[PDB]
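Rotation project, supervised by the postdoc (A.L.). Task for the rotation student: set up a whole-complex structure prediction and record inputs and outputs verbatim in this book. Inputs entered:
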Amino acid sequence: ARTK
Amino acid sequence: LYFQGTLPLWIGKPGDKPPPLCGAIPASGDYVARPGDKVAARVKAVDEQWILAEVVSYSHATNKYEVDDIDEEGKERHTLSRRRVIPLPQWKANPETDPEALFQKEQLVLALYPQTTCFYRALIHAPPQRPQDDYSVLFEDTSYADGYSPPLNVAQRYVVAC
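Outputs recorded:
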């Protein structure tokens, strides 16, 4: 997943 | 071609309730997502995090889903209780016909943050008033003294109950  | 998975507008007839997974209308309590469906999935992080994922399968024996994390690097599999899976809406609600199927101002939601594949807590700033418009939301952000982002737009596709 790509987080902030 | 450009907007794979964009949501259809729900159009109901007289006496039809806006259905489960139209906008803000919740899934039924026994609902089971199909392979390929998009969900918010609560997974262990470094802490926990809601991520955009795709359903692979569901076992009625264990009540667990297998889901794949949707990332650019390639997929990562998670096995999750149905309690950790929130189905994404399958229709956008039309404010002009079914305004009650939209989350209202100040409601706490989980929303996809720009340039991420993750969902984060936000308060609704404004529901759309036209079907072509999206939500405005204030994300929680502890880097700011008042704790909230400026208003940011998020499509109905990516706003779910917290």
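Student's summary: The CA atoms of residues 136 and 152 of chain B lie 5 Å apart.
Supervisor addendum: Strands of chain B lie at 38-44, 48-59, 64-69, 76-81, 85-87, 108-112, 118-126, 135-139, 152-154, 159-161.
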